[PDB]
Write a protein that binds this DNA or RNA. Structure first.
Ligand SMILES: [Mg+2]
Ligand SMILES: [Mg+2]
Ligand SMILES: [Mg+2]
Ligand SMILES: [Mg+2]
Ligand SMILES: [Mg+2]
Ligand SMILES: [Mg+2]
Ligand SMILES: [Mg+2]
Ligand SMILES: [Mg+2]
Ligand SMILES: [Mg+2]
Ligand SMILES: [Mg+2]
Ligand SMILES: [Mg+2]
Ligand SMILES: [Mg+2]
Ligand SMILES: [Mg+2]
Lengths: 195, 76, 183, 90, 169, 183
RNA sequence: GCGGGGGCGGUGGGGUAAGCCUCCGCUCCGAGACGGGAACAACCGAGACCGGGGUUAAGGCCCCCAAGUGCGGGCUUAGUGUCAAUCUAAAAGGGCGUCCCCCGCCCAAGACAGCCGAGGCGGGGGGCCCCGAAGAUGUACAGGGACUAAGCCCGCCGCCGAGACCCCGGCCCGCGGGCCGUUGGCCCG
RNA sequence: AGGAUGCCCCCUCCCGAAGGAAACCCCGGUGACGGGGGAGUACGAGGGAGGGGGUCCAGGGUCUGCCCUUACGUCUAGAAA
């Protein structure tokens, strides 16, 4: 359909200061600061008009189609994650599951290393991005923390992907005559806030 | 500016009732001819306008028409 | 100093040289105006600067693949240096080739017109050092920026199809930035 | 981007009344607005105009939607733009 | 059999007078009316679906038979023979010809190429016009989804585009 | 004085702008009326939606009544099928006849160009009077069948009714001479 | 001369089809210049004595290339496509991808989705586009540059543009008339 | 053996077929633009008259620029083939 005018409002929580800067004809840079840190997000080439009103972020589209109107809900959802990111933080939880070979997960500096995955001599090494903290709880659980939910979720997804074999190395998911097969890996199990 | 309710039907068997905002009935009909011509590949001879009537904004069905009525500015 | 002006399509001088700042201009649309100017003013020289800031509309992957196919698949099986095509990659050479395609072919007037065109990436130092540099824009050939519209610059195309050559030019800009900034 | 709003003084760039000043007095849709010279003042009749054929100036007066010519003319006095309207650009 | 595209278009006059045609093939459709055909029980049915031709053309006898089988089997399975009436509405009157070199078909058939080109009978087809009803169904409104599916399967066997029209009796 | 200019049709491209120009140069102030949705010109009096009780207000307020009757009137007078459907008379015929007769009764000025004089003749308002018409065979015959004396002048005034052959071939002086005449 | 050929029409009749075979009719090429169609006997325009001026036809008006980066509305995101045919293409089928039209039912704020508060569920159709869509010397071929309109749909305004049409000058011709003693010459209409 | 009483430029004047504007004023249209006046004007193939200045003009060889342009003879429905 067609939208003459549509508006959305995102209430800024207490202690959070939001700055909106126009870096181009339709580009925006939104800086969000809270007790837990500062996030910076870019909204480039966008039809959404972004503005501040006494403690809210106002999002508007004018003369918009479905494509442009759909971006109001998206930007509201992104901004809400930013506000919760600087007040409560984001924690993604992962579970280590093995069948015969116990995996050894350790964090050394800014490297996350997984050893003995399926008894392989190769070592899975991942680079931990700035703003992400990884802690290994016992032998079964991994926790990824940060203020940028996109950054934190993406890294947690990378850990899970690193243990998913592809091509000729992919094991059969089901066993003989239909039981569970070789299902080893690290699986993202859920998320929650730090506070 | 007024909302015009345009009732019509086409030689291809399609019927329509639409609300178009315009200054005069002539302007509203021009929008109907060009939009229907664009969106359904209908020549002007294939379109038969049966009834044109002003409908007050309070009773209109289209939120597009209502929102245009109260416009204070436009952007290009 | 640099003085920015709008080029009057009916008040082009018959003699001398005009400098057109290509920034924000659509490549094919600016080439069309440049080609006509060179033919209709047989004594005028045309300089185009900032050729790496020319814009090609469309999806980045679509534009890059089009250039990749041109520089890779278009060839000859006869003697390549004697009989084959020679595809430009650098933005100043790319744009000059675009103008060649809009000029009369295999005639002196088409050849003479192209010899009266000079294209530069960024602004040359000698042009900058001038006491008064008049830079023209052609508004009908300028890109009207709209949300959710896709386009690329000739510089981004060059980086995609010749990264090492682009890196050197980028480094040269950095090396001479201080002296260029002084002038 | 171009912004046309009720009360804005605009210049017509197409048609016989090209170069003349006018005041936006109503919005038809996203593409057309209503402008009035006022005629007695600048020579622009009260008609609809496409947005592509006007350019906004930096002057704005305060009026209601569909303001009559007299109301527009009075508001042109509280702002002191009467001689601004008689001037023809280009 | 040749691909059906070879006999799809109407390229000449109808060829149906079997008293002038030597070796005209027999019709290979066993029944044309399926389900509950008695007029008394059809009064229970109150809905009508039609598979209507969208173009003019020739439908071969084996395509009509293939369409009849798939739709009637589906209706028998899902609706029940007591709850529907299905009629194949067109009859393959037109005789198709082919110009091929053959033995035991006449001496002229032994000359190669376009000499003596008039073909020997090769099959049968129905000549249909746009808007013509190919299949006709009478059913109870509770089975609308099943009847539409049966006619969708019939249409996939036919050489011309068709459309399904549902109306009350 | 004020004149009401009923724009029935615009198929004759220059009929309405020319008629309005002459009336303005004749000292009148012209109000435009429209009775159909196909006319593209601006108007201030909507004869399509104007209530019938408001008609007596209209006769008092205007001193002249002019009819820009293009080919719509021409094919209605002849009772003939036009070559275009848009040339059909798609206005309220009873209201139009009511307007002409009422303005005529109060001895107000009537301007009848092209085929309008034959429409006024068919209403019986020119019996025994002098009038001109668009000089085609059928229109001249209709004037003579309604006991009107056809005159072969461009602009003819019969004491309150001005008839013109074709406003687009009428000079300003001829029209203004008849406006300033006595009736 | 008694070899014809092209376009369009008779589902002509035949043939899987054919730039195929065999009839019927108008026109054109053969025996016809010239403008447009990228090139091109027969597609569109149009019929050419010679020179010059003017105006149009088909078609075109971003550059190549004379004339519009012409006007209003809408659609497409695929460089899809880029103003009939010869000429370089596409089907059955799938897609709320997106724009739009209609119908049935629910909600009278106790509907749909997991107390909340406003619209919701299903069917039929239309436009554009996507998949279906695979080839051999050399680039998103169908003129090239390139273009997000310089594409497509509904409408509109002006202009360019032939040897056509108009005008001037020159020439020749057919027919008729007249004059000159003429196997011919000259003049006029 | 051709013109040199020429040719060329400028200026001025006269006549002028078909055709034929513009600035600007007025009326209409969102607009590209249309219409009334300006104006059948300025101009316009060509046909006449004069004045000032210059020196060859026509013709030819060859080269360049722009526009146009598919060897000939032949049988053939169809020839650059
Ligand atoms: Mg070399
Ligand atoms: Mg046949
Ligand atoms: Mg023969
Ligand atoms: Mg023939
Ligand atoms: Mg021959
Ligand atoms: Mg050609
Ligand atoms: Mg040009
Ligand atoms: Mg097919
Ligand atoms: Mg393509
Ligand atoms: Mg001599
Ligand atoms: Mg031969
Ligand atoms: Mg041969
Ligand atoms: Mg030859």
């Amino acid at each position: 359909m067609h939208v003459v005018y549509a508006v959305e409002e995102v209430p800024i929580p207490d202690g959070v200061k939001v700055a909106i800067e126009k870096t181009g004809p339709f580009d925006y840079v939104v800086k969000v600061k809270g007790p837990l840190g500062e996030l910076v997000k870019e909204f480039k080439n966008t039809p959404v008009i972004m503005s501040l009103s006494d403690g809210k972020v106002v999002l508007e589209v004018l003369n918009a189609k479905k494509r442009e109107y759909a971006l109001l809900g998206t930007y509201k959802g992104i901004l809400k994650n930013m506000f919760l990111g600087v007040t409560k933080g984001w924690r993604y939880k992962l579970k280590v599951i093995y069948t015969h070979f116990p995996m050894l997960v350790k964090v050394q500096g800014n490297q996350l290393t997984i050893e003995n995955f399926l008894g392989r001599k190769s070592k899975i090494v991942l680079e931990i991005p700035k703003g992400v903290k990884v802690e290994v709880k016992g032998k079964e659980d991994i926790v990824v923390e940060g203020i940028d939910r996109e950054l934190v979720s993406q890294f947690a997804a990378a850990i899970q992907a690193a243990t998913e074999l592809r091509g000729e190395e992919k094991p059969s998911p089901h066993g003989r005559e239909g039981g569970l097969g070789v299902v080893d890996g690290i699986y993202v199990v859920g998320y929650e806030h730090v506070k | 500016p007024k909302i015009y309710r345009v009732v019509g039907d086409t030689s291809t068997g399609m019927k329509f009732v639409v609300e178009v905002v315009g200054e005069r009935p002539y302007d509203a009909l021009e929008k109907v001819y060009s939009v229907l011509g664009s969106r359904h590949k209908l020549k002007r001879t294939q379109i038969r306008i049966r009834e044109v009537s002003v409908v007050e904004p309070s009773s209109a069905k289209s939120n597009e028409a209502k929102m245009l009525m109260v416009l204070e500015k436009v952007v290009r | 100093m640099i003085v920015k002006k709008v080029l009057d399509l009916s008040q082009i001088p018959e003699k001398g040289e005009i400098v057109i700042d290509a920034e924000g201009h659509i490549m094919g649309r600016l080439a069309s105006y440049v080609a006509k100017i060179l033919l209709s003013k047989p004594e005028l020289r045309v300089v185009v600067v900032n050729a790496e800031k020319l814009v090609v509309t469309g999806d980045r992957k679509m534009v890059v693949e089009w250039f990749m196919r041109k520089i890779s698949e278009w060839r000859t099986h006869y003697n390549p240096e004697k009989a084959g095509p020679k595809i430009p990659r650098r933005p100043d050479r790319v744009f000059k080739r675009v103008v060649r395609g809009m000029l009369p072919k295999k005639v002196e007037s088409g050849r003479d017109a192209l010899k009266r065109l000079r294209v530069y990436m960024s602004i040359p130092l000698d042009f900058i050092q001038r006491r008064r540099l008049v830079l023209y824009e052609v508004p009908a050939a300028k890109l009207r920026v709209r949300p959710l519209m896709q386009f690329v610059t000739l510089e981004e195309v060059w980086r995609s199809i010749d990264p090492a050559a682009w890196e050197k030019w980028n480094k040269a800009k950095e090396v001479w930035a201080k002296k260029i900034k002084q002038a | 981007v171009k912004v046309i709003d009720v009360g804005r003084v605009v210049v017509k760039v197409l048609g016989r009344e090209a170069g003349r000043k006018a005041v936006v007095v109503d919005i038809v849709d996203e593409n057309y607005v209503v402008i009035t010279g006022p005629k007695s003042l600048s020579g622009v009749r009260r008609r609809r105009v496409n947005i592509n054929h006007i350019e906004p100036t930096d002057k704005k007066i305060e009026i209601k939607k569909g303001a009559s010519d007299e109301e527009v003319l009075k508001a042109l006095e509280a702002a002191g733009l009467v001689e601004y309207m008689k001037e023809r650009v280009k | 059999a040749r691909p059906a595209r070879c006999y799809r278009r109407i390229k000449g006059p109808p060829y149906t007078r079997e008293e002038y045609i030597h070796g005209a093939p027999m019709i290979q459709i066993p029944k044309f009316d399926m389900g509950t055909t008695s007029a008394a029980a059809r009064a229970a049915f109150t809905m009508v679906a039609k598979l209507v031709a969208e173009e003019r053309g020739q439908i071969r006898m084996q395509a009509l038979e293939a369409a009849r089988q798939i739709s009637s089997k589906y209706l028998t399975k899902y609706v029940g023979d007591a709850n529907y009436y299905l009629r194949l509405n067109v009859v393959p009157h037109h005789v198709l010809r082919e110009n091929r070199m053959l033995a035991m078909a006449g001496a002229d058939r032994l000359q190669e190429g376009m000499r003596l080109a008039f073909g020997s009978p090769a099959g049968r087809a129905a000549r249909v016009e746009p808007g013509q009803v190919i299949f006709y169904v009478e059913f109870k409104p509770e089975h609308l989804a099943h009847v539409k599916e049966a006619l969708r399967r019939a249409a996939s066997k036919l050489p011309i585009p068709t459309r399904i029209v549902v109306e009350p009796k | 004085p004020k004149a009401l200019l009923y724009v029935i049709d615009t198929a004759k491209r220059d009929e309405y702008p020319t008629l309005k120009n002459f009336l303005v140069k004749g000292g009148y102030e012209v109000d435009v009326a429209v009775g159909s949705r196909d006319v593209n010109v601006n108007y201030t009096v909507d004869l399509m939606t104007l209530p019938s009780d408001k008609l007596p207000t209209l006769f008092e307020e205007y001193d002249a009544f002019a009819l820009a009757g293009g080919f719509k009137i021409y094919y209605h007078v002849l009772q003939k099928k036009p070559p275009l459907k848009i040339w059909d008379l798609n206005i309220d015929k009873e209201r139009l006849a009511q307007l002409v007769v009422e303005f005529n009764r109060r001895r107000k000025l009537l301007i009848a160009p092209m085929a309008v004089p034959a429409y006024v003749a068919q209403l019986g308002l020119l019996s025994g009077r002098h009038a001109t018409v668009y000089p085609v065979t059928e229109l001249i015959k209709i004037l003579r069948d309604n006991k009107v004396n056809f005159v072969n002048k461009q602009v003819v005034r019969s004491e309150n009714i001005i008839t013109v052959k074709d406003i687009t071939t009428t000079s300003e002086k001829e029209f203004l001479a008849a406006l300033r005449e006595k009736g």
